[PDB]
Write a structure and sequence with these properties.
Largest sheet: 2 strands, antiparallel
Distance between the termini: 19 Å
Order of helices and strands: HHEHHEH
CATH topology: Recoverin, domain 1
CATH class: Mainly Alpha
Strand order of the largest sheet: 1-2
CATH superfamily: EF-hand
CATH architecture: Orthogonal Bundle
Number of strands: 2
Shape: globular
Length: 90
């Protein structure tokens, strides 16, 4: 499946009340404070929630932060990489 397919999975897997909890970690690196954090932020949130990212996820983020790291993503994208990790990892 594609990452877009994972978007639909992520959105349905976690309830709004649950997303609100992870959203708090999102706000940590959010400069404007609305729906936007660097690629490095999602890596840090995994650590704060105590969740282990999948090889595909951690390598992808590492790639983006290694080459740039300034690029930012929204809640949806963040939710994808987090859910995709727990789906396959344990």
């Amino acid at each position: 499946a594609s990452m877009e397919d994972l978007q639909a999975e992520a959105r349905a897997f976690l309830s709004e009340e649950m997303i609100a909890e992870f959203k708090a970690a999102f706000d940590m690196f959010d400069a404007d404070g609305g729906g936007d954090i660097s690629y490095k932020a999602v890596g840090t949130v995994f650590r704060m929630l105590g969740i282990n990212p999948s090889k595909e996820v951690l390598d992808y983020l590492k790639e983006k932060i290694d080459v740039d790291g300034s690029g930012t993503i929204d809640f949806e994208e963040f939710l994808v990489l987090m859910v995709y990790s727990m789906k396959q990892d344990a």
